[PDB]
């Protein structure tokens, strides 16, 4: 159908979302130590069991 529609707005929403700079955080261990940190997180000490289990909850 129509092919010469406007082009004015190309790059609109990216160029109007307010920047927020990344936040500086602890550096995560690479390799083994990470698989390690997961194991203890995922299994060893556990966290919750609300109903079952959740992995990225926020306000609950």
């Amino acid at each position: 159908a129509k092919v010469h529609g406007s082009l004015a707005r190309a790059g609109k929403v990216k160029s109007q979302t307010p920047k927020v700079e990344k936040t500086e955080k602890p550096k995560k261990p690479k390799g083994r130590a990470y698989k390690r940190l997961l194991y203890t997180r995922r299994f060893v000490n556990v966290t919750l069991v609300n109903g079952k289990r959740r992995m990225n909850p926020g306000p609950s």
Binding site: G31, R32, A33, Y34, K35, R36, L38, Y39, T40, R42, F43, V44
Partner: protein
């Protein structure tokens, strides 16, 4: 015009990419044996798979068939050699059984921990890859060395590094140089 340098890969990847259960399963293993990769688990189950294959293909040949007896014995005597296969189950319907942790339970990584000497599967790694501990006088820095049973009695720190005498080495020797240089003259 030269002979091909031959090679092969040593690992294989899960058909299903995201099986929640196999994933939990895998991560635990890593956590138990101080692995860094899911590949290090892939590698082994791949070794296991082919072993199981040859074990299958053999056990369909007649009992007391030449190849079956030759290659079958050979297979078992290799497995027992490293301490994966139990002396009791020495007849390859339990090679056909077998399973991964039996293989895992035999890496240098593990043995260096299992009998004291490290008190952490991770410390176990770190130590090995840092030129401590050896098999003979021969130092080994590869965590997946796989301890050949009759080399288990000879695992100990190397005659070099600390932990086996012969120096503290630069990071401690730095502090000792800081004691007779500040306090004294």
């Amino acid at each position: 015009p030269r002979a091909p340098r031959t090679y092969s890969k040593t690992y294989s990847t899960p058909k299903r990419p995201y099986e929640s259960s196999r994933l939990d399963a895998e991560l635990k293993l890593a956590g138990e044996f101080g692995l860094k990769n899911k590949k290090e688990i892939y590698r082994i189950s791949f070794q296991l798979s082919k072993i199981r294959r040859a074990a299958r293909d053999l056990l369909t040949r007649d009992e007391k068939d030449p190849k079956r007896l030759f290659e079958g014995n050979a297979l078992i005597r290799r497995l027992v050699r490293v301490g994966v296969l139990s002396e009791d189950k020495k007849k390859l319907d339990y090679v056909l059984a077998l399973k991964v942790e039996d293989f895992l339970e035999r890496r240098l990584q593990t043995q260096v921990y299992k009998l004291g000497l490290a008190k952490s599967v991770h410390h176990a790694r770190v130590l090995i890859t840092q030129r401590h501990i050896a098999v003979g006088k021969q130092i080994v820095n590869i965590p997946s060395f796989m301890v050949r049973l009759d080399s288990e009695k000879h695992i100990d720190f190397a005659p070099t590094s600390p932990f086996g005498g012969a120096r503290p080495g630069r990071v401690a020797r730095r502090n000792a140089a800081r004691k007779a240089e500040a306090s004294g003259e």
